[PDB]
Amino acid sequence: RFDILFLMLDIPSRDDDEKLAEHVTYVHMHNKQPDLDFTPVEPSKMREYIAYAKTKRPVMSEAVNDYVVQAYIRLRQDSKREMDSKFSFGQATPRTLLGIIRLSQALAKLRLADMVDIDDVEEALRLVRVSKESLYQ
C-alpha cells in the first residue's frame, strides 16, 4: 500500500565522501550552508504556493491517460517477468498506477494549469524505477 520507498544504502565514495565531508567541513565553519550556487525558498513564501497549487486539481488528458495504461501492462509485464525473488518487487498492482496517475496529478499541481502533461506523467514513472534499482550499487 506504499507508493514509494527510497533505499538509503550508503557505499563510501572517496570523491563523494570528501565533497560531503567538505559540506561537513563547511559547517560548523559557518551558519550559512547553501552556495555555488543556490537560493532555497523560505517556507512561508514557499508554503503559500503549496495550497495555492493545491486549489488547481489538474484534470487528466486522455492522451497521457491511455499511455499510462500502456506502460502499466508493461510494468504489469516486466515486474512479473522478474518472477522469483531477486531484485523484485512485483506485481505492479493498480494501486501504484492508481497513485502514479495521482502523481502526475500531484506533479501537475506544481505546473498548476491542470493540463497533465505526458512528460508530467512520465516524470513520475522516472521516479518509480529510481525508488528501486539502486540496489545494484
Partner 1 sequence: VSVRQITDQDLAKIREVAAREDLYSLLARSIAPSIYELEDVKKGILLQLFGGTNKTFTKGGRYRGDINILLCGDPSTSKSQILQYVHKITPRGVYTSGKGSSAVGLTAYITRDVDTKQLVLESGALVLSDGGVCCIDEFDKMSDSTRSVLHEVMEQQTISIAKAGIITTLNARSSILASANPIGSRYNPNLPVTENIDLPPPLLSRFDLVYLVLDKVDEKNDRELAKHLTNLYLEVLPVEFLTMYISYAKEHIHPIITEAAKTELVRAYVGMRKATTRQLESMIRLAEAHAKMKLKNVVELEDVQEAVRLIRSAIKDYATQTGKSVIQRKLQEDLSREIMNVLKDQASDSMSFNELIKQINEHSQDRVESSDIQEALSRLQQEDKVIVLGEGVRRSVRL
Partner 2 sequence: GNLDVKKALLLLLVGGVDKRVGDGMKIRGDINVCLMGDPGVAKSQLLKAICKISPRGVYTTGKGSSGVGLTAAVMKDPVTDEMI
Interacting residues toward partner 2 by CB under 8 A = 1-10, 16, 20, 43, 46-47, 50-51, 53-54, 56-58, 98-99, 102-103, 105-107, 109-110, 127, 130-131
DSSP one-letter string for 12-36: --HHHHHHHHHHHHHHHH-S----S
- Non-local (6+) Cβ contacts of 115 within 8 A are 58, 59, 61, 108
> Residue 135 carries which DSSP code?
G
Cell representation of residue 119: 512528460
- Residue 118 in the binding site for partner 1 (CB under 8 A): no
Cβ-contact 104, 114 below 8 angstroms: no
Residues annotated in the binding site for ATP, as ranges?
A: 1, 95
Q: How far is the CB of 18 from partner 2 (least distance, A)?
A: 13
- Residue 26 in the binding site for partner 1 (CB under 8 A): no
Q: Which does 76 bind (CB under 5 to 8 A by kind): partner 2, partner 1, none?
A: partner 1
Q: How far is the CB of 4 from partner 2 (least distance, A)?
A: 5
- Residue 97 in the binding site for partner 1 (CB under 8 A): yes
Neighbouring C-beta atoms of residue 115, cutoff 10 Å: 13
Cβ-contact 76, 92 below 8 angstroms: yes
Q: How far is the CB of 71 from partner 2 (least distance, A)?
A: 18
Write out the residues near partner 1 by the rule CB under 8 A: 1, 59-60, 65-66, 68-70, 72-73, 76-77, 80, 90-91, 93-95, 97-98, 101
